Ligand binder design. Sequence first.
Ligand SMILES: [Zn+2]
Length: 36
Amino acid sequence: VICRECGKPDTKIIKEGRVHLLKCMACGAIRPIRMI
Ligand SMILES: [Zn+2]
């Protein structure tokens, strides 16, 4: 769903303070997210 044209890559997530960032490796994609 998130990455359909990525196949079998890797997923890493980092959060600081009150902000969430998602990074995907293989396609080099970054997405900004925040719930709090
Ligand atoms: Zn990807």
